[PDB]
């Protein structure tokens, strides 16, 4: 997206470039969330490495049954937030359960929100850094493309 | 509707404008300072003509639609994922 | 193969019997109201109009045991 | 995918009545904005912490026959409506 948006050096008033940039950034977000759907069942792909220092989800009482798998955990805890039943989002320590895993559908309405958060940080930096400032690029995930997962 | 309409026609501001439109500054009928009242015309202009119109324009006014377009393999994916198996 | 329908069955005297099925004998359930192609087509021939073809076509019409007596499909958000 | 048609208050009567309410009665700020005043950017457990003490003080005065039960509990965020 940044390679395409700094390729817009075509002679234009700065105001025009801000909009034809924000449109492309929103389109890139769209193409990312569309491809996210085709990997909604790969829990290992939607996994975050929590450090032993960071705040961590509480360990389910059945992850203490991995046998010769609890030993692999030395530094990182790989957690995926799944959504059993409804409303509640619970964390699963991915590497403490035998494979292949069976899980409730992955709460992509939580991981994609954080990924998008950092994407909007980068996009707000570039939007307010090359052209005129004053624009916090926000993608309406909750309305435009929330239905795909929740 | 019934409360909204009674407000939109007979609200305190509209009523104040109307009573200021009928207040006189002279008793002679041919030299009266009273002027035509805007109550009904304003009420019809905003609420009533529009409601008579919505009486399928109702859909156009009250639709606020959100149709996301998903073309390609994602359409096939969304189908099996969110519909009873074939 | 998922996703699947989930139904609710009211029994006698009471008891909400929930039933999740992967396939079912719907041919048997609708067999009573299934009109053969010969019948439906024939009625139209001898009887014009789409306000009278339908008139004729309509005029021509244990939890496991209660499955084929009472079903209530349950909305899945 | 038609996944939203506005809501219960998109009727012209509903949208007109809501607009007249603001003009005549006043603006009722949303939950998020009000919580933002008490240094909460939704974090909600951050305020729920200090709130637990007041709630426990209330119960151990008005509802004492179960007093020593919520001395040590952890607020677990479950339901999130934009006003609840």
**What is the 3-state secondary structure of C7-62?**
EEEECCCCCEEEEECCCCCHHHHHHCCCCCHHHHHHHHHHCCCCCCHHHHHHHCCC
CA distances from A76 to A66, A110, D63 (A): 16, 20, 45
For A27, the 3-state DSSP assignment is helix
Residue C1 touches chain B, beta carbons under 8 Å: yes
Structure tokens at A13: 């008033």
In sequence order, the 6+-apart residues with CB closer than 8 A to the CB of A20 are A8, A12
Contacts of A88 in chain D (CB under 8 A): 78
Q: Which of A38, A40, A147 sits opposite B73 (nearest CB)?
A: A38
Residue with tokens 């309305």: A143
Q: Take residue C43 and report the two structure tokens written for it.
A: 């009625």
Distance of CA A126 to the CA centre of its chain: 20
Q: Which of A38, A41, A139 is most worth mutating to test chain B (most B CB atoms within 10 A of its CB)?
A: A38
Q: B50: part of which helix (H) or strand (E)?
A: helix B49-54
Q: Which residue of A has its CA nearest to B77?
A: A38
Report yes or no: C7 and C1 within 8 Å, Cβ to Cβ.
Answer: no
B86 vs C1: CB contact, 8 Å cut-off? Answer: yes
Interface test with A, best of B72, B78, B81, B82 (most A CBs within 10 A): B81
* 3 state SS for chain D: CEEECCCCCCCHHHHHHHHHHHHHCCCCCCHHHHHHHCCCCCCHHHHHHHHHHHHHHHHHHHCHHHCCCCCCCCCCCCCCCCCC
- Please tell me which residue of chain B has the smallest CA distance to D9: B62
Closest CA to A102 of A62, A50, A150: A62
Q: Identify which of C20, C58, C13, C22 has the alpha carbon closest to the alpha carbon of residue C40.
A: C58
How far off is chain D from B61, nearest CA to CA, in Å? 7
Nearest to D79 among A87, A143, A147 (CB): A87
The residue of chain B with its CA nearest to that of A39 is: B77
D21 CB within 8 Å of a chain B CB? no
Using an 8 Å CB-CB cutoff, list chain B residues near A143: 66
SS3 A91: strand
Q: Which residues of A touch B66 (CB under 8 A)?
A: 143-144
Residue in chain B closest to D15 (alpha carbons) equals B62
* Residue with token string 């974090």: D43
Q: Does C5 touch chain B (CB under 8 A)?
A: yes
Nearest CB to D4; choose among B51, B54, B66: B66
CB of B64 within 8 A of CB of D5? yes
Cβ contacts from B onto D, under 8 A: 46
Beta bridge partners of residue C8, listed in sequence order: C18
- Distance, in Å, from the CA atom of A143 to the CA atom of A104, rounded to the nearest integer, reads 23
Is B16 in the A-facing interface, judged by CB distances under 8 Å?
A: no
* Vertex B76: Cα angle to B75 and B77 (nearest 5): 90
Of B23, B13, B20, B21, the residue nearest B46 (C-alpha)? B13
Query: Residues near B18 by Cβ (< 8 Å), separated by ≥ 6?
Result: B37, B38, B39
Chain CA centroid to CA C23, Å: 14
CB–CB contact C22 B86 (8 Å): no
Interchain pair B77, A37: CB under 8 A: yes
Chain B CB contacts of A147 under 8 Å are 68
Q: Which two tokens stand for residue B13?
A: 């501001």
Total count of residues recorded for chain C: 77
Chain B residue nearest residue D23, CA to CA: B13
Residues from chain B contacting residue D10 (CB–CB below 8 Å): 62-64
For residue C16, the cross-strand partners are C10
Which residues have a Cβ under 8 Å from the Cβ of C70 and sit 6 or more positions away? C9, C10, C11
Q: What φ, ψ does residue D45 adopt, rounded to 5°?
A: -60, -25
Distance CA A38, CA A59 (A): 29
d(Cα D16, Cα B1) in Å, to the nearest integer?
9
């Amino acid at each position: 997206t940044l390679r395409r948006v700094l390729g817009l050096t075509t002679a234009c008033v700065p105001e025009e470039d801000a909009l034809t940039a924000r449109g492309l950034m929103e389109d890139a977000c769209d193409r990312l969330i569309l491809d996210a759907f085709n990997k909604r069942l790969d829990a290992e792909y939607w996994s975050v490495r929590v450090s032993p220092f960071e705040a961590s989800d509480p360990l389910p009482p059945t992850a203490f049954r991995g046998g010769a798998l609890l030993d692999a955990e030395h530094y990182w805890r790989r957690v995926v937030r799944v959504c059993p039943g409804g409303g509640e989002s619970v964390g699963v320590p991915v590497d403490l359960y035998p494979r292949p895993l069976v899980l409730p559908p992955v709460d992509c309405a939580h991981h994609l929100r954080e990924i998008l958060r950092e994407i909007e940080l980068v996009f707000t930096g570039v939007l307010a850094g090359v052209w005129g400032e004053g624009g916090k690029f926000v993608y309406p995930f909750d309305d435009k493309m929330s239905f795909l997962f929740a | 509707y019934i409360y909204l309409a009674h407000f939109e026609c007979f609200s305190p501001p509209r009523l104040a404008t109307h009573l200021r439109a009928v207040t006189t500054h002279d008793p002679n009928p041919a030299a009266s300072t009273e002027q035509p009242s805007p109550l009904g015309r304003e009420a019809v202009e905003q609420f009533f003509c529009h409601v008579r119109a919505q009486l399928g324009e109702y859909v156009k006014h009250n639709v606020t639609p959100r149709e996301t377009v998903l073309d390609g393999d994602t359409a096939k994916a969304y189908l099996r994922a969110r519909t009873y198996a074939p | 193969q998922t996703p699947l329908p989930v139904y609710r069955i009211s029994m006698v005297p009471t008891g909400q019997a929930f039933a999740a099925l992967a396939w079912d004998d719907w041919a048997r359930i609708t067999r009573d109201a299934r009109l053969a192609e010969a019948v439906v087509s024939a009625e139209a021939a001898a009887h014009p109009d789409h306000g009278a073809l339908g008139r004729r076509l309509t005029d021509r019409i244990d939890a496991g045991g209660q499955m084929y007596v009472n079903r209530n499909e349950i909305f899945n958000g | 995918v038609l996944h939203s048609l506005g809501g219960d208050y998109v009727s012209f009567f509903e949208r007109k009545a809501s607009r007249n309410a603001l003009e005549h009665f006043g603006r009722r700020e949303t939950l998020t904005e009000v919580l933002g005043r008490y240094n909460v950017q939704p974090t909600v457990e951050g305020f729920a912490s200090e709130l637990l003490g007041r709630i426990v003080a209330c119960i151990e005065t008005h509802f004492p026959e179960h007093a020593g039960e919520y001395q040590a509990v952890s607020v677990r965020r479950a339901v999130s409506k934009d006003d609840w």
